[PDB]
Paper text:
The structures of the heterodimer were determined in complex with the methyl donor SAM, the product of the reaction (S-adenosylhomocysteine, SAH), and pan-methyltransferase inhibitor sinefungin (SFG). The nsp16 protein catalyzes the transfer of the methyl group from SAM to the Cap-0, generating the reaction products SAH and Cap-1. Notably, SAH and SFG interact with the same residues as SAM without modifications in the site or the overall structure. The high resolution of the structures with bound SAM, SAH, and SFG could facilitate the computational design of small molecules that have higher affinity than SAM for the SAM-binding cleft and have specificity for SARS-CoV-2 nsp16 compared to host methyltransferases. Thus, the heterodimer is the most soluble and stable form of the 2-O-MTase complex, and the dimer of dimers in the large unit cell formed as a result of crystal packing.
To facilitate structure-based drug design, we conducted an X-ray crystallographic study of the SARS-CoV-2 nsp16-nsp10 2′-O-methyltransferase complex, which methylates Cap-0 viral mRNAs to improve viral protein translation and to avoid host immune detection. Nsp16 is a 7-methylguanine-triphosphate-adenosine (m7GpppA)-specific, SAM-dependent 2′-O-MTase that is activated upon binding to nsp10 (16, 19). However, the main known function of nsp10 is the stabilization of the SAM binding pockets of nsp16 and nsp14 (19). The 2’-O-methylation of coronavirus RNA that is mediated by the nsp16-nsp10 heterodimer is essential for preventing recognition by the host to evade immune responses that are triggered by viral mRNAs.
Residue numbers in the entry:
A (entry chain B): 4271 to 4392
B (entry chain A): 6800 to 7096
Write the structure that this text describes.
């Protein structure tokens, strides 16, 4: 049953005061993108920074299996949009956050699927 | 004036001179461009290279095949590969390689000496940033270098589709006479210097539209001396200005035609289409690559 849990190990490491994983590859972009979480090309808006996905994935960076039967990675080969207030730790952000399966925005950082129905606009 | 360009291409008149080789002494050697916040030098460098490649007649078929040599960094990631994948159309196949292990956004990554890399298929674009660490730590008579450059020359002559292009990184000391001679096998070529790294003797030898045969006989030792003469006499101002406007960065998907023509069917009309970036000649078989593994106890 034994299984290494790198996710909780990185969260505990940060909680203690450990320096977040560095050298995440930040991309040059217009910052006029859709703001979606994971995209085929940089889609950062004015409140985000776009990074190469593989460099922001704990499993890719630590050279360890991905936590899913197929061993598939959702970041590798794509671009991840990280809020500027969290761009100092992109690996930690992708771990602690979830992409909305409906709008493609991060939960709590873009997804508005739970807000009230705006009085309809003409 | 050139400060707002992504970099500077060697003027054509230098290709027709017969300069004697000597030290590359750059006037702007002790300068640095203002890198945008949190942007690595290699992201800036590849972004300017891609900005310049956008101005050339690159063949861009659907299902484009790109191979990137020297893609690893001492950081354990692939900044250049991330820029190439941002630049290339979404359906483009990207394979990268390096002597050292690294994490990449490429479709496939091969670790080991490029000499161990094999492939049954032809490629549409070859990018190389390979540079031997000894070239730096050890200085000696500036003769043609024959390590990974011999592999690149063989790879261009056997695995590059006609109409395909290359961007091979060279420096004052990291260069090869046979590679310059092969530039004569392309419809057009140049030495491109990125404005962010203009304080370095570094340049990308760009071969545009491979013809599989020499349109011009080039003496590699003389052409490298011509390149050094240009770098020594035309100072390039360090500049990061082109990095702030990424609106027209993506390579336009031209949908260039791919045909599996024979060597006896390559007439003057075909060479003319290849020379305009309007044709790619190669089969479209399943892309298969591998890295040799030395076995020993
Ligand atoms: N014979 C060879 N085969 C493969 N890679 C080689 C090589 N000689 C040198 N290299 C690689 O060339 C690289 C030069 S540094 C490359 C930086 C990288 N392009 C980036 O985007 O940051 C080194 O990683 C080195 O390992
Ligand atoms: Na792209
Ligand atoms: Zn991963
Ligand atoms: Zn949502």
């Amino acid at each position: 049953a034994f299984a290494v849990d790198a996710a909780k190990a990185y969260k505990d490491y940060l909680a203690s005061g450990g320096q977040p994983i560095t050298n995440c590859v930040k991309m040059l972009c217009t910052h006029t993108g859709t703001g979606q979480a994971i995209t085929v090309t940089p889609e950062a808006n004015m409140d985000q920074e776009s990074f190469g996905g593989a460099s922001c994935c704990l499993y890719c960076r630590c050279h360890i299996d991905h936590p899913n039967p197929k061993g598939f990675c959702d970041l590798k080969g794509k671009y991840v949009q990280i809020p500027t207030t969290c761009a100092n730790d992109p690996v930690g952000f992708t771990l602690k956050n979830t992409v909305c399966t409906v709008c493609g925005m991060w939960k709590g950082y873009g997804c508005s699927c739970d807000q009230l129905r705006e009085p309809m606009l003409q | 004036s050139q400060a707002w360009q992504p970099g500077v291409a060697m003027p054509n008149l230098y290709k027709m001179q017969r300069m004697l080789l000597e030290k590359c002494d750059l006037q702007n050697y002790g300068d640095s461009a203002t890198l945008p916040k949190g942007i690595m030098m290699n992201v800036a460098k590849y972004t300017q290279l891609c900005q310049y490649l956008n101005t050339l007649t690159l063949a861009v078929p659907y299902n484009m095949r790109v191979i990137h040599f020297g893609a690893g960094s001492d950081k354990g990631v692939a900044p250049g590969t991330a820029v190439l994948r941002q630049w290339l159309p979404t359906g483009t196949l990207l394979v990268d390689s390096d002597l050292n292990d690294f994490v990449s956004d490429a479709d496939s990554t091969l670790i080991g000496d490029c000499a161990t890399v094999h492939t049954a298929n032809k490629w549409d674009l070859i990018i190389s940033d390979m540079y031997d660490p000894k070239t730096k730590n050890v200085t000696k008579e500036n003769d043609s270098k024959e390590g990974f450059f011999t592999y690149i020359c063989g790879f261009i002559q056997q695995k590059l589709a006609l109409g395909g292009s290359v961007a091979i990184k060279i420096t004052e000391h990291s260069w090869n006479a046979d590679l310059y001679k092969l530039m004569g096998h392309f419809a057009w070529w140049t030495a491109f210097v990125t404005n962010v790294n203009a304080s370095s003797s570094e340049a990308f030898l760009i071969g545009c539209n491979y013809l599989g045969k020499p349109r011009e006989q080039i003496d590699g030792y003389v052409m490298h001396a011509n390149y050094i003469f240009w770098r020594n006499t035309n100072p390039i101002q360090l500049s990061s200005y082109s990095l702030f406007d990424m609106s027209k960065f993506p390579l336009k998907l031209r949908g260039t035609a791919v045909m599996s023509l024979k060597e006896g069917q390559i007439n003057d009309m075909i060479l003319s289409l290849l020379s305009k970036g309007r044709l790619i000649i190669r089969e479209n078989n399943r892309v298969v690559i591998s890295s040799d593994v030395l076995v020993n106890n």
